[PDB]
Coordinates of C-alpha atoms and ligand atoms in Angstrom, one line a residue:
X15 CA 103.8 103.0 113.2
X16 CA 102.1 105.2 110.8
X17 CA 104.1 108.6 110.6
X18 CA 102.9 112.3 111.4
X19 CA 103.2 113.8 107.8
X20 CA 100.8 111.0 106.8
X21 CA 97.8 112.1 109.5
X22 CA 95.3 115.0 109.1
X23 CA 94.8 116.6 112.3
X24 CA 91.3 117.1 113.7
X25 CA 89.6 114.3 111.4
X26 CA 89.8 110.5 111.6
X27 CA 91.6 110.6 108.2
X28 CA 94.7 109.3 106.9
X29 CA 96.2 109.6 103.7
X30 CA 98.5 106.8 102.1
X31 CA 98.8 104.8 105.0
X32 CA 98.2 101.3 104.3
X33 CA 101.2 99.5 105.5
X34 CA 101.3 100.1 109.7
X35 CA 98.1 97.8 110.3
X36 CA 95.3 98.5 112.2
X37 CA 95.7 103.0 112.4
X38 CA 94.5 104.3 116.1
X39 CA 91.6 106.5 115.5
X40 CA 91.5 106.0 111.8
X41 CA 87.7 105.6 110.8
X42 CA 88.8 106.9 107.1
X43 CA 91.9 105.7 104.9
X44 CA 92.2 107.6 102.1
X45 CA 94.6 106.5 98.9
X46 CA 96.2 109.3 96.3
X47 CA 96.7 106.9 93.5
X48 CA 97.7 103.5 92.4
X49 CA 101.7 103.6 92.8
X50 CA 102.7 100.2 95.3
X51 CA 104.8 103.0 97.8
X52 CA 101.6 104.5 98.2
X53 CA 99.1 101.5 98.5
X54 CA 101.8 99.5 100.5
X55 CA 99.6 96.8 102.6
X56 CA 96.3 96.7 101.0
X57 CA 94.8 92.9 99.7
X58 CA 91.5 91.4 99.9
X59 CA 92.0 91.4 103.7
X60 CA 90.9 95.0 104.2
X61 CA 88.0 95.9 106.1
X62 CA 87.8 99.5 106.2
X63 CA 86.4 102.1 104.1
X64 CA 88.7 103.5 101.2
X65 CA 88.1 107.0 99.5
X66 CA 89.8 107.1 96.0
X67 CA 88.9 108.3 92.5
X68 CA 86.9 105.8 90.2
X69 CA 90.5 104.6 88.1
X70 CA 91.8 103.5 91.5
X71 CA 88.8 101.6 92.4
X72 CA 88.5 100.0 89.3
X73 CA 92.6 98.8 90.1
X74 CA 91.7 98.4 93.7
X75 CA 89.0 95.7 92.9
X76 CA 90.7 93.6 89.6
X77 CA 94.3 94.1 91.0
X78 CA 94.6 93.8 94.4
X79 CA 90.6 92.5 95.1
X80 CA 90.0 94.9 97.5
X81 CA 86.0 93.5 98.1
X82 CA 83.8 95.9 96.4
X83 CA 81.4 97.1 99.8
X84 CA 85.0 98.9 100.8
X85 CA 85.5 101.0 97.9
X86 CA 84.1 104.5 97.9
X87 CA 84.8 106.2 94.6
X88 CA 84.3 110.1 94.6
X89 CA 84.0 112.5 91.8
X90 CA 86.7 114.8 90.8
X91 CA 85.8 118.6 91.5
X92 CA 83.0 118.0 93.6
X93 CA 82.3 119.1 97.1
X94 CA 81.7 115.7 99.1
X95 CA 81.1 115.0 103.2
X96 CA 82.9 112.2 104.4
X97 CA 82.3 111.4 108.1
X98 CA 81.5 114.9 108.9
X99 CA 84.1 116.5 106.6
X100 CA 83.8 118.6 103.7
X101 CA 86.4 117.3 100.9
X102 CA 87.4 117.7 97.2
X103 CA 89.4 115.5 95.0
X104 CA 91.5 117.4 91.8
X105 CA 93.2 115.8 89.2
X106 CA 96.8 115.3 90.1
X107 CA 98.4 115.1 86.5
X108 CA 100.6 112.0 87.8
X109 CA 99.5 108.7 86.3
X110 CA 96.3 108.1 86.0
X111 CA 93.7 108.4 88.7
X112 CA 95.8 110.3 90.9
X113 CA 94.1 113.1 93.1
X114 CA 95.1 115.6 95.3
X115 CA 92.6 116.1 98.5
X116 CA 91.6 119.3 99.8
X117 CA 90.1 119.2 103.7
X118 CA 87.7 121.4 104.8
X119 CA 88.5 121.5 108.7
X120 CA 85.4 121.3 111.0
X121 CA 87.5 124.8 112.9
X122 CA 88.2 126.3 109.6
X123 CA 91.7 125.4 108.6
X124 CA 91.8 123.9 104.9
X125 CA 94.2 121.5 104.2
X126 CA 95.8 120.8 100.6
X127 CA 97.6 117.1 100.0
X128 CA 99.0 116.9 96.4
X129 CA 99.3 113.2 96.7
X130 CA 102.3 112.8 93.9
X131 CA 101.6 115.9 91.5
X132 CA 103.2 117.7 88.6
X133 CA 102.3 121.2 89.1
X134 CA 100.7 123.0 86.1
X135 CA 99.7 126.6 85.5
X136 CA 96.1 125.1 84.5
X137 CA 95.8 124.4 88.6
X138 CA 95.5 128.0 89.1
X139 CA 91.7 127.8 87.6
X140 CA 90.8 125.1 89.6
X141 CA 88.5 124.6 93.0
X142 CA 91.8 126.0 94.7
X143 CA 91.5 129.6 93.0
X144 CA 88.6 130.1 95.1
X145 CA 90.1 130.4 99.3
X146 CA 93.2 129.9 101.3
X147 CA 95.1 127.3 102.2
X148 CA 96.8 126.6 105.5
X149 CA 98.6 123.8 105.2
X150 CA 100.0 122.3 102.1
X151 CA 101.2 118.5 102.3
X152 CA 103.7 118.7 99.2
X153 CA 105.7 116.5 96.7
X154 CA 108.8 117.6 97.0
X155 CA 110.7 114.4 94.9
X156 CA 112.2 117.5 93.0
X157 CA 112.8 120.0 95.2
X158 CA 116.4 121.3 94.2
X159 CA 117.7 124.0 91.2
X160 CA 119.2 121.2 89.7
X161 CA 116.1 119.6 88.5
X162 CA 115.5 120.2 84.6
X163 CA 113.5 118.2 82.1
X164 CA 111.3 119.1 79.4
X165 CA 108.0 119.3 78.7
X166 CA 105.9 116.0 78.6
X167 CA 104.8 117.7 74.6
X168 CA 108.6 117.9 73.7
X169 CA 109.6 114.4 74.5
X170 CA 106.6 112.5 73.2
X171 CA 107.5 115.2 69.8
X172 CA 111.0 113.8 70.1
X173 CA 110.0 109.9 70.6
X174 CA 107.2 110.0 67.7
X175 CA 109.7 111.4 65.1
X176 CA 112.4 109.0 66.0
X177 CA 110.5 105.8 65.8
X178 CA 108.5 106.8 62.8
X179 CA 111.8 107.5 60.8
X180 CA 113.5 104.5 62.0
X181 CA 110.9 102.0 60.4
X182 CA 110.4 104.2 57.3
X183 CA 113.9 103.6 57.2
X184 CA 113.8 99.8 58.0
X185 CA 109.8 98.3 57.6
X186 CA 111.3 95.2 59.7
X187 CA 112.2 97.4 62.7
X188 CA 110.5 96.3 65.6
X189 CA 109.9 99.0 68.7
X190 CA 110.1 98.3 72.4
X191 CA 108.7 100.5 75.4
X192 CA 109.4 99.6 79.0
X193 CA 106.9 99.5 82.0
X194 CA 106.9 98.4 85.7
X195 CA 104.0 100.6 87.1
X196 CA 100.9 102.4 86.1
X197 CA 101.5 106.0 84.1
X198 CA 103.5 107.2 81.1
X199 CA 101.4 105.5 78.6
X200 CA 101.3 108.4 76.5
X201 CA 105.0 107.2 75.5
X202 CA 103.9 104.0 73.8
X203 CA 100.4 104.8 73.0
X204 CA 102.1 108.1 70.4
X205 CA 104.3 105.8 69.1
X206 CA 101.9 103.0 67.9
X207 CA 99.5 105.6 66.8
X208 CA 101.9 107.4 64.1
X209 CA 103.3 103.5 63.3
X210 CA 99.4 102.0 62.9
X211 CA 99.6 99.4 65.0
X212 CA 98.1 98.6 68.2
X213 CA 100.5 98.0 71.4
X214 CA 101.1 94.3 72.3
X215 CA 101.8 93.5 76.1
X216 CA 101.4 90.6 78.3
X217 CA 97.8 89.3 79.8
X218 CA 98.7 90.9 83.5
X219 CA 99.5 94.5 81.8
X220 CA 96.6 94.4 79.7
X221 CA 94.5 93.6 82.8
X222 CA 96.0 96.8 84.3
X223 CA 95.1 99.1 81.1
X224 CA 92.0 97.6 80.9
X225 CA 91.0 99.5 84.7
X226 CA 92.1 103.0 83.4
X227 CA 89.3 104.9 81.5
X228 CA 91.0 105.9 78.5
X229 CA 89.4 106.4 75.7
X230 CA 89.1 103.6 72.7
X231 CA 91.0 101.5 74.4
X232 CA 90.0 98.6 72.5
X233 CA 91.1 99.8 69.5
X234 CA 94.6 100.7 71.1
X235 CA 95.7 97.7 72.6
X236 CA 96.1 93.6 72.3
X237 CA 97.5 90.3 74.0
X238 CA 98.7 88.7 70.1
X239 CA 102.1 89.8 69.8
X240 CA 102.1 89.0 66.6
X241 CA 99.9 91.3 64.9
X242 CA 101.6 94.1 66.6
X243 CA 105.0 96.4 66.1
X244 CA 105.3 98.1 69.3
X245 CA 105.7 95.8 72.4
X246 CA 105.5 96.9 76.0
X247 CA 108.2 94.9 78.2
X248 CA 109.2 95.0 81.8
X249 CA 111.6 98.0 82.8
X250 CA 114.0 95.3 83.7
X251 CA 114.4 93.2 80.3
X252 CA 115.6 96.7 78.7
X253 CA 119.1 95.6 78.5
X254 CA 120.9 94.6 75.3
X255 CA 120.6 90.4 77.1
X256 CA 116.8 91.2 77.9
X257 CA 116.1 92.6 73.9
X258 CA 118.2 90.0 72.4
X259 CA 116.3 87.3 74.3
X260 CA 112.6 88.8 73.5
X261 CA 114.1 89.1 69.6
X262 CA 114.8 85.4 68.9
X263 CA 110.8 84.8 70.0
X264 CA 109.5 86.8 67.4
X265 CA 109.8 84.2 64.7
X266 CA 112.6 86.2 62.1
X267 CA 109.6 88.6 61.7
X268 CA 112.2 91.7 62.5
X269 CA 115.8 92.4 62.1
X270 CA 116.4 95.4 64.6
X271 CA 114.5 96.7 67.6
X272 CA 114.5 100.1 68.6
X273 CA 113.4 100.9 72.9
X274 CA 112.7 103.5 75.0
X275 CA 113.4 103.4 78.7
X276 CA 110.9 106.2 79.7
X277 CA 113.2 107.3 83.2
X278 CA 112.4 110.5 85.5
X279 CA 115.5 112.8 85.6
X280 CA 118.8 111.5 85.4
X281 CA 121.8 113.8 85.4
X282 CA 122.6 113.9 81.8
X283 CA 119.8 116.3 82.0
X284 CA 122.6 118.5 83.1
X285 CA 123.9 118.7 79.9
X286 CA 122.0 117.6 77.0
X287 CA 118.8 119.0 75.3
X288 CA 116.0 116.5 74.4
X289 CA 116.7 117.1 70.9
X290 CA 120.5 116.1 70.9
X291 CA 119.9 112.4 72.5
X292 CA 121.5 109.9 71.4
X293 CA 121.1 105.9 72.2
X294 CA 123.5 103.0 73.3
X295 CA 123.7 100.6 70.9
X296 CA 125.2 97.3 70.3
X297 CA 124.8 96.2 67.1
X298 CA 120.9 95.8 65.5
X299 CA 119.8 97.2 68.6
X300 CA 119.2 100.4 70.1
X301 CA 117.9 101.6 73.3
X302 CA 116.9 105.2 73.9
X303 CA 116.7 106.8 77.7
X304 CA 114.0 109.5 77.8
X305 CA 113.2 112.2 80.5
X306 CA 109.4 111.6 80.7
X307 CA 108.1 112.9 84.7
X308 CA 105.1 112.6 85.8
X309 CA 106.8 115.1 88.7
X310 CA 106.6 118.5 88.9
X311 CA 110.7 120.6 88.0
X312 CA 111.8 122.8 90.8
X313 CA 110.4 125.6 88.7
X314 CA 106.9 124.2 88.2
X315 CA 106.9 123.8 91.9
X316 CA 107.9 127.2 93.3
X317 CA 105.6 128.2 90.3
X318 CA 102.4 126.6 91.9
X319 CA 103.4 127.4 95.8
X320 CA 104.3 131.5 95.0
X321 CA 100.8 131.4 93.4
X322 CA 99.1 129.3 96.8
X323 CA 100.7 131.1 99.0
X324 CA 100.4 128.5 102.2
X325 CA 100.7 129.7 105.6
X326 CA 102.9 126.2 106.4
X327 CA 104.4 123.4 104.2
X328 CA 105.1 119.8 105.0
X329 CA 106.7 118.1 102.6
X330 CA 106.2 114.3 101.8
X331 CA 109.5 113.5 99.8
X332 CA 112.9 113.7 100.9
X333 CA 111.9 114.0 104.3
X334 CA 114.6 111.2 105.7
X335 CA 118.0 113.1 106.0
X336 CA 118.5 116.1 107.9
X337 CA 120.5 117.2 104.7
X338 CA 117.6 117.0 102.7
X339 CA 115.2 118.9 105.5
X340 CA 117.3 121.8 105.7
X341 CA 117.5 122.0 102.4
X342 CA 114.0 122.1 101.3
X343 CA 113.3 124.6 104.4
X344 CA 116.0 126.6 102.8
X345 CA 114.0 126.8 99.3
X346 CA 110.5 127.1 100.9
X347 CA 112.0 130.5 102.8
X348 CA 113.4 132.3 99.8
X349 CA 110.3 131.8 97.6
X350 CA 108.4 133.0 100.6
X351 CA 110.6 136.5 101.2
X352 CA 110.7 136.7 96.9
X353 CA 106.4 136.7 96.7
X354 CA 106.1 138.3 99.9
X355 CA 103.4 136.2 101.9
Ligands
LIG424 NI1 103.5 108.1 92.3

């Protein structure tokens, strides 16, 4: 059964709720982005209508073949009635094609869901600067003091400069990027552009890139892993066994490989700057763990929510431990009696 965080009261709507069957009421199902939590239950199947951005569509029609009479793309920053209702998708700066959805009540209220977001001063000069929000429906995945990480600018600074001197160093370097979902493909795209060479990746990933929009894609990316020094892999195959394995296939073109394991936090965050990372490594290989989130920090969260200013929150992350619940209440109260709203 689809639960209450998930409903927007006073509409037909749901958002991200996709895996409880048939929804009582719902004559709108509306999907934040293209991450399998989130679109959890969608196929072929499905016979109601979908609201999404245009990335998503394209992914909800090649990937999961979603029939195309089903798929209702909207624009980004555009007012739009659906069913009665006044909404607005805004880019979400997840991965790509993510939105948040603002709700224009039929009694007034407005509604903000961030979907997955990372928050960013650049949101203040948005659609949102414009009127009050009454409820915010917010990712809280970092919600705690303890979450630190750079700047998405700094690490992609940090993983350019590293590969490019490791194969001025050694020309028969070859460098390895791991993937197991949509986002993040600034990491490998910035490393085969300073390296010249286009990314190589398996026929189902390319697929998948292929649905995204981005720019020259075509000259970016290939299926012939042979003209190429920068593969993508699965997350899972970036192991000293997994690199070792994909090494012998290449054909004694290369003699070392360099990877990146792009992660979210991890708690050697706690004590060591993006510029003093170090790999494992076990002999010609290397493997690299970098903070790249596509989440907002604690900071850039209480940032964006001081400057909203939200009559109530209900967060969307966390929510399963009474732990975590108090917690988060905890937080939402301080930065509440700090503004003053
Ligand atoms: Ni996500």
């Amino acid at each position: 059964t689809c639960p209450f965080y998930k409903k927007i009261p006073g509409t037909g709507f749901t958002v991200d709720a996709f895996q409880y069957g048939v929804v009582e009421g719902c004559t709108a199902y509306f999907l934040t982005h293209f991450h399998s939590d989130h679109y959890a239950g969608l196929s072929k199947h499905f016979t109601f209508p979908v609201y999404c951005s245009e990335i998503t569509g394209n992914l909800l029609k090649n990937k999961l073949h979603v029939q195309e009479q089903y798929i209702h793309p909207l624009p980004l920053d555009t007012e739009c009635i659906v069913n009665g209702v006044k909404v607005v998708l805004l880019d979400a700066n997840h991965c790509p094609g993510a939105v948040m959805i603002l709700f224009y009540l039929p009694n007034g209220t407005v509604i903000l869901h961030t979907g997955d977001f990372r928050a960013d001063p650049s949101m203040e000069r948005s659609l949102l600067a414009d009127q009050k929000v009454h409820m915010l429906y917010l990712d809280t995945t970092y919600c705690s003091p303890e979450y630190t990480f750079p700047s998405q600018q700094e690490v992609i600074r940090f993983a350019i400069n590293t590969a490019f001197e490791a194969v001025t160093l050694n020309p028969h370097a070859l460098v390895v990027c791991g993937t197991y979902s949509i986002g993040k493909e600034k990491v490998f795209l910035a490393i085969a552009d300073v390296l010249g060479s286009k990314v190589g990746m398996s026929q189902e990933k390319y697929k998948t890139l292929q649905c995204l929009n981005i720019p020259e894609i075509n000259s970016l990316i290939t299926t012939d892993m042979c003209s190429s020094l920068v593969h993508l892999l699965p997350m899972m195959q970036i192991n000293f066994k997994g690199l070792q394995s994909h090494l012998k296939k290449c054909g004694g073109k290369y003699n070392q490989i360099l990877a990146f394991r792009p992660t979210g936090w991890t708690h050697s965050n706690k004590f060591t700057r993006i510029a003093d990372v170090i790999p494992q490594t076990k002999g010609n290989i290397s493997i690299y763990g970098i903070p790249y989130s596509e989440h907002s920090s604690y900071l850039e969260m209480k940032r964006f929510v001081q400057w909203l200013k939200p009559q109530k929150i209900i967060p969307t992350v966390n929510v399963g431990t009474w732990k975590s619940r108090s917690t988060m209440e905890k937080y939402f109260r301080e930065w509440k009696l700090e503004a003053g709203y």
